[PDB]
Each structure stands twice: as structure tokens, then as C-alpha cells.
Amino acid sequence: APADKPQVLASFTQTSASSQNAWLAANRNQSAWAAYEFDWSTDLCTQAPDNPFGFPFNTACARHDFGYRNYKAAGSFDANKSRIDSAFYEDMKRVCTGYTGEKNTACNSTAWTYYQAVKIFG
């Protein structure tokens, strides 16, 4: 793979909105990143806890899968797990800012539950 793969992977897995935006564009143009041989497989949120109100967290889950799978493939998962989990929480909270009142609180509560369910692993 190209020499800057580790840096590209780091850039796609930060908690910032810019890192998520960069990843979203790559996700829509995966073929343009073929040289990097990234693992683009994802279960979306199928292995996550219940989502009774149906907040659209699928893309948050997809970027989290990307982070986990690719850092595990690089053999450096333990040291990056925390940031990936945090980035997942931030992606979900970005979704929640689009709601007010009770829905905003319910959305943040679900985001927290999703985050805690992965944080339990370490």
C-alpha cells in the first residue's frame, strides 16, 4: 500500500467533523482509495443496542467499523480503540443536534448507550 496509509487511516478516524467529512467522501468514492486496500466492510448498526426512536446512526456505526477493522488489520487496535469509540460518540452527537427538546435528550441518551456498549470492551 502507499507509504502514507497510516496517516490517511489516522485522518479518517479523528473525532472532528472534518475527519468524519473526509471519511464520508471516501466512503462514497471507495474505488478512488483502492490503492490503500482498506477494509470497507460494515454491519452498520446491526450489532448495536436497540434504537427505539430510530435515529439515523448507520453512518456513525459504519465509520466505527472502519476504524476497528482497519486498526485491527494494522495490528495496533488497543492503542487506538479509545479514540475510535470517542469518534463514534461524536458522530452520533452530531446527528442529535438536529433535534430539540425531548428528542434531543432521547437522541443523546441513545448515543450514550451505543457508546457505552462498545466502551465495555475496553
PDB file of C-alpha atoms in Angstrom:
ATOM      1  CA  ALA A   1       0.000   0.000   0.000  1.00  0.00           C
ATOM      2  CA  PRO A   2       1.113   3.614  -0.310  1.00  0.00           C
ATOM      3  CA  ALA A   3       3.621   4.948   2.238  1.00  0.00           C
ATOM      4  CA  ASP A   4       1.117   7.384   3.787  1.00  0.00           C
ATOM      5  CA  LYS A   5      -1.550   4.772   4.581  1.00  0.00           C
ATOM      6  CA  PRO A   6      -1.038   5.025   8.371  1.00  0.00           C
ATOM      7  CA  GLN A   7      -1.512   8.825   8.194  1.00  0.00           C
ATOM      8  CA  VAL A   8      -4.573   8.505   5.939  1.00  0.00           C
ATOM      9  CA  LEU A   9      -6.104   5.993   8.371  1.00  0.00           C
ATOM     10  CA  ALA A  10      -5.451   8.375  11.294  1.00  0.00           C
ATOM     11  CA  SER A  11      -7.032  11.250   9.317  1.00  0.00           C
ATOM     12  CA  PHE A  12     -10.228   9.223   8.758  1.00  0.00           C
ATOM     13  CA  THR A  13     -10.532   8.324  12.443  1.00  0.00           C
ATOM     14  CA  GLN A  14     -10.401  11.580  14.440  1.00  0.00           C
ATOM     15  CA  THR A  15     -13.346  12.912  16.499  1.00  0.00           C
ATOM     16  CA  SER A  16     -13.577  16.127  14.459  1.00  0.00           C
ATOM     17  CA  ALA A  17     -16.309  16.944  11.977  1.00  0.00           C
ATOM     18  CA  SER A  18     -13.612  17.406   9.309  1.00  0.00           C
ATOM     19  CA  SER A  19     -12.350  13.814   9.825  1.00  0.00           C
ATOM     20  CA  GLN A  20     -15.889  12.484   9.523  1.00  0.00           C
ATOM     21  CA  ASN A  21     -16.483  14.602   6.384  1.00  0.00           C
ATOM     22  CA  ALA A  22     -13.273  13.346   4.808  1.00  0.00           C
ATOM     23  CA  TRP A  23     -14.277   9.765   5.570  1.00  0.00           C
ATOM     24  CA  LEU A  24     -17.800  10.227   4.234  1.00  0.00           C
ATOM     25  CA  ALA A  25     -16.433  11.450   0.898  1.00  0.00           C
ATOM     26  CA  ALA A  26     -14.059   8.448   0.731  1.00  0.00           C
ATOM     27  CA  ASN A  27     -16.899   6.099   1.634  1.00  0.00           C
ATOM     28  CA  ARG A  28     -18.873   7.419  -1.369  1.00  0.00           C
ATOM     29  CA  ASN A  29     -15.768   7.029  -3.559  1.00  0.00           C
ATOM     30  CA  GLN A  30     -14.203   3.834  -2.179  1.00  0.00           C
ATOM     31  CA  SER A  31     -12.757   2.874  -5.577  1.00  0.00           C
ATOM     32  CA  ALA A  32     -10.700   6.086  -5.603  1.00  0.00           C
ATOM     33  CA  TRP A  33      -8.966   4.672  -2.496  1.00  0.00           C
ATOM     34  CA  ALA A  34      -8.336   1.204  -3.946  1.00  0.00           C
ATOM     35  CA  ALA A  35      -4.551   1.675  -3.715  1.00  0.00           C
ATOM     36  CA  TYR A  36      -4.863   1.629   0.099  1.00  0.00           C
ATOM     37  CA  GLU A  37      -6.666  -1.714   0.321  1.00  0.00           C
ATOM     38  CA  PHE A  38      -8.766  -0.602   3.278  1.00  0.00           C
ATOM     39  CA  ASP A  39     -11.348  -2.982   4.756  1.00  0.00           C
ATOM     40  CA  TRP A  40     -14.641  -1.250   3.783  1.00  0.00           C
ATOM     41  CA  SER A  41     -16.876  -3.921   5.286  1.00  0.00           C
ATOM     42  CA  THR A  42     -19.507  -2.902   7.860  1.00  0.00           C
ATOM     43  CA  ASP A  43     -22.558  -4.339   9.654  1.00  0.00           C
ATOM     44  CA  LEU A  44     -23.828  -0.764  10.105  1.00  0.00           C
ATOM     45  CA  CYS A  45     -25.660  -0.727  13.471  1.00  0.00           C
ATOM     46  CA  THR A  46     -26.961  -4.322  13.363  1.00  0.00           C
ATOM     47  CA  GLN A  47     -24.733  -5.375  16.259  1.00  0.00           C
ATOM     48  CA  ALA A  48     -25.580  -2.304  18.341  1.00  0.00           C
ATOM     49  CA  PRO A  49     -28.209  -1.950  21.136  1.00  0.00           C
ATOM     50  CA  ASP A  50     -31.850  -1.079  20.478  1.00  0.00           C
ATOM     51  CA  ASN A  51     -32.724   2.255  18.834  1.00  0.00           C
ATOM     52  CA  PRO A  52     -36.438   2.686  19.727  1.00  0.00           C
ATOM     53  CA  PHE A  53     -36.803   6.138  18.210  1.00  0.00           C
ATOM     54  CA  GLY A  54     -34.964   5.268  15.010  1.00  0.00           C
ATOM     55  CA  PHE A  55     -32.238   7.910  14.954  1.00  0.00           C
ATOM     56  CA  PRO A  56     -30.100   7.621  11.772  1.00  0.00           C
ATOM     57  CA  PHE A  57     -26.852   6.312  13.295  1.00  0.00           C
ATOM     58  CA  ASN A  58     -25.873   3.954  10.454  1.00  0.00           C
ATOM     59  CA  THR A  59     -23.048   6.163   9.115  1.00  0.00           C
ATOM     60  CA  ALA A  60     -21.727   6.646  12.653  1.00  0.00           C
ATOM     61  CA  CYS A  61     -21.644   2.868  13.011  1.00  0.00           C
ATOM     62  CA  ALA A  62     -20.022   2.434   9.573  1.00  0.00           C
ATOM     63  CA  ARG A  63     -17.097   4.751  10.389  1.00  0.00           C
ATOM     64  CA  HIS A  64     -16.661   2.970  13.743  1.00  0.00           C
ATOM     65  CA  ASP A  65     -16.493  -0.413  11.930  1.00  0.00           C
ATOM     66  CA  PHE A  66     -13.940   1.093   9.566  1.00  0.00           C
ATOM     67  CA  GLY A  67     -11.802   2.250  12.476  1.00  0.00           C
ATOM     68  CA  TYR A  68     -11.959  -1.078  14.319  1.00  0.00           C
ATOM     69  CA  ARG A  69     -11.385  -3.332  11.308  1.00  0.00           C
ATOM     70  CA  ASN A  70      -8.523  -1.369   9.821  1.00  0.00           C
ATOM     71  CA  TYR A  71      -6.637  -0.805  13.067  1.00  0.00           C
ATOM     72  CA  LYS A  72      -7.023  -4.484  13.865  1.00  0.00           C
ATOM     73  CA  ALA A  73      -5.632  -5.223  10.386  1.00  0.00           C
ATOM     74  CA  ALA A  74      -2.656  -2.967  11.158  1.00  0.00           C
ATOM     75  CA  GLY A  75      -2.086  -4.771  14.464  1.00  0.00           C
ATOM     76  CA  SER A  76      -2.429  -1.578  16.523  1.00  0.00           C
ATOM     77  CA  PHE A  77      -6.001  -1.822  17.808  1.00  0.00           C
ATOM     78  CA  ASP A  78      -5.549  -1.479  21.608  1.00  0.00           C
ATOM     79  CA  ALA A  79      -3.891   1.950  21.438  1.00  0.00           C
ATOM     80  CA  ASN A  80      -6.486   3.413  19.059  1.00  0.00           C
ATOM     81  CA  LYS A  81      -9.683   1.863  20.449  1.00  0.00           C
ATOM     82  CA  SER A  82     -10.434   4.791  22.758  1.00  0.00           C
ATOM     83  CA  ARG A  83     -10.311   7.445  20.036  1.00  0.00           C
ATOM     84  CA  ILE A  84     -12.379   5.315  17.638  1.00  0.00           C
ATOM     85  CA  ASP A  85     -15.029   4.820  20.335  1.00  0.00           C
ATOM     86  CA  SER A  86     -14.968   8.553  21.079  1.00  0.00           C
ATOM     87  CA  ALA A  87     -15.261   9.476  17.390  1.00  0.00           C
ATOM     88  CA  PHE A  88     -18.289   7.153  17.186  1.00  0.00           C
ATOM     89  CA  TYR A  89     -19.899   9.045  20.115  1.00  0.00           C
ATOM     90  CA  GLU A  90     -19.148  12.420  18.481  1.00  0.00           C
ATOM     91  CA  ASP A  91     -20.617  11.281  15.139  1.00  0.00           C
ATOM     92  CA  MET A  92     -23.812  10.244  16.905  1.00  0.00           C
ATOM     93  CA  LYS A  93     -23.999  13.512  18.859  1.00  0.00           C
ATOM     94  CA  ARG A  94     -23.733  15.453  15.583  1.00  0.00           C
ATOM     95  CA  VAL A  95     -26.922  13.642  14.486  1.00  0.00           C
ATOM     96  CA  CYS A  96     -28.628  14.644  17.736  1.00  0.00           C
ATOM     97  CA  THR A  97     -28.011  18.404  17.325  1.00  0.00           C
ATOM     98  CA  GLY A  98     -30.657  18.309  14.615  1.00  0.00           C
ATOM     99  CA  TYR A  99     -33.321  17.698  17.284  1.00  0.00           C
ATOM    100  CA  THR A 100     -34.684  19.866  20.108  1.00  0.00           C
ATOM    101  CA  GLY A 101     -36.434  19.257  23.393  1.00  0.00           C
ATOM    102  CA  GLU A 102     -37.241  15.698  24.417  1.00  0.00           C
ATOM    103  CA  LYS A 103     -35.991  14.280  21.126  1.00  0.00           C
ATOM    104  CA  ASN A 104     -32.620  15.888  21.579  1.00  0.00           C
ATOM    105  CA  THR A 105     -32.360  14.345  25.056  1.00  0.00           C
ATOM    106  CA  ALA A 106     -33.591  10.935  23.823  1.00  0.00           C
ATOM    107  CA  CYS A 107     -31.124  11.080  20.930  1.00  0.00           C
ATOM    108  CA  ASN A 108     -28.195  11.876  23.225  1.00  0.00           C
ATOM    109  CA  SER A 109     -29.303   9.106  25.609  1.00  0.00           C
ATOM    110  CA  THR A 110     -29.285   6.538  22.770  1.00  0.00           C
ATOM    111  CA  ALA A 111     -25.899   7.816  21.550  1.00  0.00           C
ATOM    112  CA  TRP A 112     -24.566   7.349  25.087  1.00  0.00           C
ATOM    113  CA  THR A 113     -25.974   3.812  25.302  1.00  0.00           C
ATOM    114  CA  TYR A 114     -24.373   2.877  21.978  1.00  0.00           C
ATOM    115  CA  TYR A 115     -21.063   4.350  23.123  1.00  0.00           C
ATOM    116  CA  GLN A 116     -21.175   2.550  26.479  1.00  0.00           C
ATOM    117  CA  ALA A 117     -21.906  -0.778  24.771  1.00  0.00           C
ATOM    118  CA  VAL A 118     -18.556  -0.595  22.933  1.00  0.00           C
ATOM    119  CA  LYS A 119     -16.675   1.071  25.807  1.00  0.00           C
ATOM    120  CA  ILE A 120     -17.426  -2.015  27.928  1.00  0.00           C
ATOM    121  CA  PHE A 121     -14.901  -3.993  25.877  1.00  0.00           C
ATOM    122  CA  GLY A 122     -12.006  -1.797  26.955  1.00  0.00           C
TER     123      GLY A 122
END
